Design an enzyme around this catalytic site. Structure first.
Site, PDB file in Angstrom:
ATOM      1  N   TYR A 193       2.887   4.825   6.427  1.00 31.47           N
ATOM      2  CA  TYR A 193       4.100   4.043   6.192  1.00 31.47           C
ATOM      3  C   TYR A 193       5.308   4.978   6.037  1.00 31.47           C
ATOM      4  O   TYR A 193       6.419   4.642   6.449  1.00 31.47           O
ATOM      5  CB  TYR A 193       3.962   3.197   4.923  1.00 31.47           C
ATOM      6  CG  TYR A 193       3.090   1.961   5.030  1.00 31.47           C
ATOM      7  CD1 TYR A 193       2.689   1.456   6.264  1.00 31.47           C
ATOM      8  CD2 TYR A 193       2.686   1.286   3.884  1.00 31.47           C
ATOM      9  CE1 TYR A 193       1.903   0.312   6.343  1.00 31.47           C
ATOM     10  CE2 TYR A 193       1.907   0.149   3.955  1.00 31.47           C
ATOM     11  CZ  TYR A 193       1.519  -0.332   5.179  1.00 31.47           C
ATOM     12  OH  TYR A 193       0.739  -1.465   5.234  1.00 31.47           O
ATOM     13  N   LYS A 220       0.835  -1.199   0.000  1.00 25.56           N
ATOM     14  CA  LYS A 220       0.000   0.000   0.000  1.00 25.56           C
ATOM     15  C   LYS A 220       0.876   1.258   0.000  1.00 25.56           C
ATOM     16  O   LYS A 220       0.406   2.351  -0.318  1.00 25.56           O
ATOM     17  CB  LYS A 220      -0.978  -0.003   1.179  1.00 25.56           C
ATOM     18  CG  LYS A 220      -2.082  -1.050   1.042  1.00 25.56           C
ATOM     19  CD  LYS A 220      -2.971  -1.122   2.279  1.00 25.56           C
ATOM     20  CE  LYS A 220      -3.720   0.176   2.489  1.00 25.56           C
ATOM     21  NZ  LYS A 220      -4.641   0.112   3.658  1.00 25.56           N
TER      22      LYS A 220
END
Lengths: 361, 351
Positions: free
Chosen positions: A152, A120
Site C-alpha cells: 500500500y 491493513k
C-alpha cells in the site's frame, strides 16, 4: 453528453462492482457519468447487460495496457480499486504504474486519481498493548508509516509522484473489512459465513460459532461496498476531499456475537454462541471435506453453480474470529463534510439478501 | 417576534447551559427562539448577561412551581434536562410531574416535551446499546420519568422525545462536576507538585473502547427532535458518533498541561483517585491563588469518585444508528471535544 468519464480499474471486484453501479445512478454527483470497466477476465455475463464499457485487459502487461487504454482520450477520473494475489509489492505496483503511464499522456481532461488501499495499511508485527503510540486503534489518517514492507505504501508513493508531476489531484481510501458481494468476486466475510450457515442448515446442524471469545465479545467495524463507492465518488468530485488520505467505514461498531444471532435467524436455524471453556476451532478445518456436500446443496436448491473453494474463504473467517482492536476512525471524512454511513447490522443482512437475489444461496 | 419558546428545566446543568446558548444561535432550527431557564439557585453571574429569561424555582416545591411557571403561556417546547438525586425514585418524578402539571394547562401552543435521561438506562444488557432494549428489572427512575412523559403527552396531544446521552464531555461554571473538569483538576495538581500525570485506573478501562458526548451536541440533538417530525415520539441515544480510548485522552491531557504522564503499568492494579486527592483541599486553595483562578473549593469542582468509576468501566458503547437513519447527522470528534472542554475551562479561568 457526459459530464464526467470514469476509468474503473478492477470493475469485477466487490467495490469496483459497486462503483459501476453507483456511478450510473441519475442523481450521482459529477454526473452524468460515462464508465469504462477494466478487468483481466473476458467480459462477465453479469456486467455484460450493464451500461458499462467493459475493457478486458491484463494491466500487468504494459504493451497490452497501452493498446487498450491509450485510445480513451476522454477519461476525467481514475478509480484504481484493483488487487490481484497476495500482498505483493512489485506486481500491484507495476499494474498501477502501467495504468497511469497509459492514461495520463492521453487523457487531456484527466482531473483526479482515486487510489483504494485498506486498513491493513495500519497493521504491523505486534498487537496493540498498553503503551500509547500513534499507530494504536482507533486508526487515524496522516500517521507515520510503519517501517515494514507494505505494498500500500508503494502504491501511495506512485500516486503522489505521478499526480504531482502532472498537476492532478489524488485521494487515498482505506476501507475497513468489506461487507459486500459480487458474482465476479465472491470471496467475502459475508459470503463465507452464508455458505457455512447454508451447510449447517443442509445437514440439520446448529450454527456453531468456532471463533475465539475475544472476537465474539469485542467491538468490530466494517464497511458496505456501496458506501466505499459513495466515499470514492465524493472524493472524486468534492474539492474539500482533494489530496487527502481517508479511512472508510460504516460509521458504527458491531459485535460478531450479534451478527451471529442475526445470521442464524435469517437462515431459520439454531445457533450455538461462544461456550466458556471451549476454545477456538478452525472453520477452515471444519469445512475441509465439504466440497462434495456443497455441490449437492447447489444442485438440490437450484443455485448458480459455484465450487466451495471459490465462493467461501473459511480461513479468512478464522482470521476475523481471532482479531481484536482494529477499529478505524471516520472523523476526518466527517469533518470534511462526508456524511455517508450504514447500519452495519442492516448492511450485513442486505448482503445476504443480495446473495439470495443472485441465487448463490 | 419569536417562532418557538423554550422552557429549559435545569438551565444551570451542563446540557441545560448548552441548550441556553445553542437555542439563541442565529440559524438554530425552529428559531428565532425565546428561552426561559429554570434552576434552584439565584440567577448566576454566568447567565446574567445572556438573552435568557431566568427563573429561580425549586421544582420539587409544587406550589412554587405552579406560581412561577403557570403565567408562562407562550411556551411551545419543554426541555427537561434536570436531575437532582444520587438516585431519588420519588423526588425526580415529582419534579417532572410538577413541571408538566404547571405548564400543560396554561401553554395552549405547547407542542413537544423533550426528556433527557442517560445510558445508565441500559446498565445488564450487552452493548452496543440500542434504543429498543427493554428496561432492566431495577428501580430505575428513568422508567418513572419515561412513564410520566408517555401518558401526559398522550393525554394532551403532545409529541415527545427521550434522549439518552453517553458520558458527557462539557463544562458549566454552575455545574462543575464533569469527568473533564475532574481530570483537569488532577492534572493541575500534578503539575503544581512537579509530579507526572499518573494514571490510577484499571487496565481494561485504559485499553478498551469508550464513547462520550459533547454537551453542545446533546443540545443540538434535543433541538433536532423538538423541531423535526421524523424524530418525534422516539427514544434516542446521543453520543459523539465515534469511539476513543482513555489511554489516548490521558496522553492528550498530559500534553495539554505540558507535563509527563505515567500510563498503565502492567503489574499494578487500580488505585482510588479519590483517596489520592484525600488531603489536597488546601493545596487546591494555594493553586487557585498562585494561578489567579476563579476561586473553587476542591470538593466542588472535582468528583474524583466518578473518575474511579469510569476507570473501572468497560463495554458501555451506545449506537447512534437510529438517530442517523432518522436524519440527524450531528457528530463530534471526541478527542477535539475533550480538548475543547479544557480550553473552555481555561477561558473561564477555572484552570
Amino acid at each position: 453528453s457526459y459530464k464526467s468519464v470514469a476509468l474503473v480499474v478492477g470493475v469485477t471486484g466487490i467495490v469496483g462492482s459497486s462503483l459501476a453501479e453507483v456511478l450510473k445512478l441519475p442523481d450521482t454527483p459529477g454526473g452524468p457519468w460515462k464508465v469504462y470497466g477494466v478487468a483481466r477476465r473476458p467480459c462477465p455475463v453479469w456486467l455484460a447487460k450493464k451500461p458499462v464499457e467493459y475493457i478486458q485487459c491484463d494491466v500487468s502487461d504494459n504493451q497490452e495496457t497501452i493498446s487498450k487504454l491509450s485510445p480513451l482520450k476522454d477519461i476525467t477520473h481514475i478509480f484504481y480499486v484493483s488487487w490481484i494475489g497476495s500482498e505483493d509489492c512489485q506486481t500491484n505496483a507495476t499494474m498501477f504504474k502501467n495504468i497511469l503511464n497509459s492514461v495520463i499522456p492521453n487523457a487531456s481532461n484527466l482531473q483526479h486519481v482515486c487510489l483504494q488501499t485498506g486498513i491493513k495499511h495500519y497493521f504491523g508485527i505486534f498487537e496493540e498493548g498498553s503503551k500509547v503510540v500513534p499507530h494504536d486503534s482507533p486508526f487515524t489518517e496522516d500517521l507515520p508509516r510503519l517501517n515494514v514492507p507494505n505494498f500500500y505504501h508503494d502504491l501511495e508513493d506512485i500516486l503522489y509522484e505521478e499526480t504531482g508531476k502532472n498537476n492532478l489531484t489524488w485521494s487515498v481510501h482505506r476501507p475497513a473489512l468489506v461487507f459486500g458481494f459480487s458474482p465476479c468476486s465472491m470471496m467475502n466475510i459475508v459470503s463465507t459465513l452464508c455458505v457455512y450457515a447454508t451447510i449447517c442448515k443442509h445437514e440439520n446442524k446448529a450454527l456453531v460459532y468456532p471463533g475465539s471469545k475475544n472476537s465474539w465479545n469485542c467491538y468490530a467495524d466494517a464497511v458496505d461496498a456501496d458506501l466505499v463507492a459513495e466515499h470514492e465518488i465524493w472524493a472524486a468530485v468534492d474539492p474539500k476531499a482533494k489530496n487527502q488520505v481517508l479511512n472508510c467505514n460504516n460509521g458504527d461498531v458491531f459485535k460478531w456475537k450479534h451478527i451471529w444471532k442475526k445470521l442464524a435467524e435469517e437462515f431459520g436455524i439454531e445457533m450455538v454462541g461462544y461456550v466458556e471453556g471451549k476454545e477456538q476451532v478452525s472453520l477452515a478445518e471444519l469445512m475441509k471435506d465439504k466440497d462434495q456436500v456443497w455441490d449437492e446443496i447447489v444442485k438440490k436448491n437450484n443455485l448458480v453453480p459455484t465450487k466451495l473453494k471459490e465462493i467461501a474463504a473459511f480461513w479468512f473467517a478464522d482470521i476475523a474470529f481471532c482479531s481484536e482492536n482494529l477499529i478505524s476512525s471516520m472523523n476526518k471524512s466527517k469533518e470534511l463534510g462526508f456524511l455517508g454511513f450504514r447500519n452495519s447490522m442492516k448492511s450485513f443482512v442486505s448482503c445476504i439478501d443480495k446473495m439470495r437475489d443472485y441465487r448463490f444461496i
